[PDB]
Amino acid sequence: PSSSMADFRKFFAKAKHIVIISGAGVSAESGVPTFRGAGGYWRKWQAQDLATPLAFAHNPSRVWEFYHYRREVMGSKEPNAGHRAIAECETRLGKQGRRVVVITLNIDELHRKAGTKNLLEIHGSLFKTRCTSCGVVAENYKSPICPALSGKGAPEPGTQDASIPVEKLPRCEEAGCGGLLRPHVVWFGENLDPAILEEVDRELAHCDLCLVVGTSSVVYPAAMFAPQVAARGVPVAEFNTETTPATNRFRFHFQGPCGTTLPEALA
């Protein structure tokens, strides 16, 4: 794929509808822990252990401790230069009647914190709950989400499980439900929301320029978004610290940290 910042800028200068797909590489530059990489662990588990229907079916207290810890550390995390360039770009182009939309696999909301308004969070949010009984989704920023989680979630190896009785985990406050809440996060093996996928499809079908920033392009169906864009002939530009299995299918590959390359690209 092409390495020419010059040529990308010529496309960028003319684009009227830009889609930006963002993955964990954008969050990682803010020091947000993914618990995904080699050695990237919570106590004795990684996300593939605890971010699953299985985990929550076996030990919902431990899954909540993990998500409580992740919610809490977000208080010490801020958007990076990549989030900021993306947010500033949407604002500058919006004034010009040009559309920028972010499709993110990230659940940390840092795109929002940076000011992005046109956002599609396809994997949900650390700061949303869903009731396992009635299905209602709510925003929730409370630290701690419930009193039984106060001071829990510590990540050090050997930390004892809080073993909170499920009645003392976060509970649906909808009149008459009181069911058990889970994080409104898409876990491995779960389907994405068809309503959200419909919105994603609308942006993919109408955009004229597409950026894929900080994703390995192995998580599906997100790994297929940029290919159906290039099919129309639309330029796809990949911003990653390393090549991915999808690199050779893109018009541009700009190697390096997103927070280093994105400000130049979106300038």
């Binding site: 994997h123 994405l192 996928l197």
Partner: peptide, 4 residues
């Protein structure tokens, strides 16, 4: 579709 499902998350990989």
């Amino acid at each position: 579709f499902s998350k990989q």
